[PDB]
Symmetry: C2
Subunit: 105 residues, 2 copies
């Protein structure tokens, strides 16, 4: 299907200009949400009641209200081992870094 789902995406820490201070990892799978949001929609799974109402209001007025959009429903963190200038090896956990599941909101 071409519906709202999680897509794999690898991001190199070079994009953020962290490389010169990171030990590991040199990158990670950030992934991203993407896909069309339309019926079928489940308020207890990959959607909210509002998304159901909006999708409906959209079908009868595409020129005004847009379809809900594919966004993350579950995000994981990633730990990074890096050093500062005093040579301190540090371990920092970054939350909401990885997309695990997507849904319509």
């Amino acid at each position: 299907k071409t519906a709202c789902r999680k897509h794999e995406l690898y991001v190199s820490f070079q994009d953020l200009g962290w490389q010169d201070w990171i030990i590991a990892p040199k990158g990670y799978a950030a992934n991203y949400c993407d896909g069309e949001c339309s019926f079928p929609l489940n308020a207890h799974m990959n959607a909210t009641n509002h998304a159901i109402v909006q999708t409906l209001v959209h079908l009868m007025n595409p020129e005004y209200v847009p379809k809900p959009c594919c966004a993350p429903t579950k995000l994981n963190a990633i730990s990074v081992l890096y050093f500062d200038d005093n040579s301190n090896v540090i371990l920092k956990k970054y939350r909401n870094m990885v997309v695990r599941a997507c849904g319509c909101h």
Copy 2:
């Protein structure tokens, strides 16, 4: 502005054709999220780390990765009084029905 924000939107149950089972209310302010998600990211859009990274990665390879999507960050519930198939009068609380705030996730 063209930035991600909450747009006012009243929904009438008659327009949806639901004016048969739903007794009260006759409609309610559903609102919806719309707008572009890109820098600058206003603090109110409570953008996650993942959205920040995606916005950046998108800006480097738009043909590849898309912009985060504008979606609700805070929603309210509404109670509705309706008749079911067996003519029973039910009062059901519907969560995630009213959009209060929008952000980039």
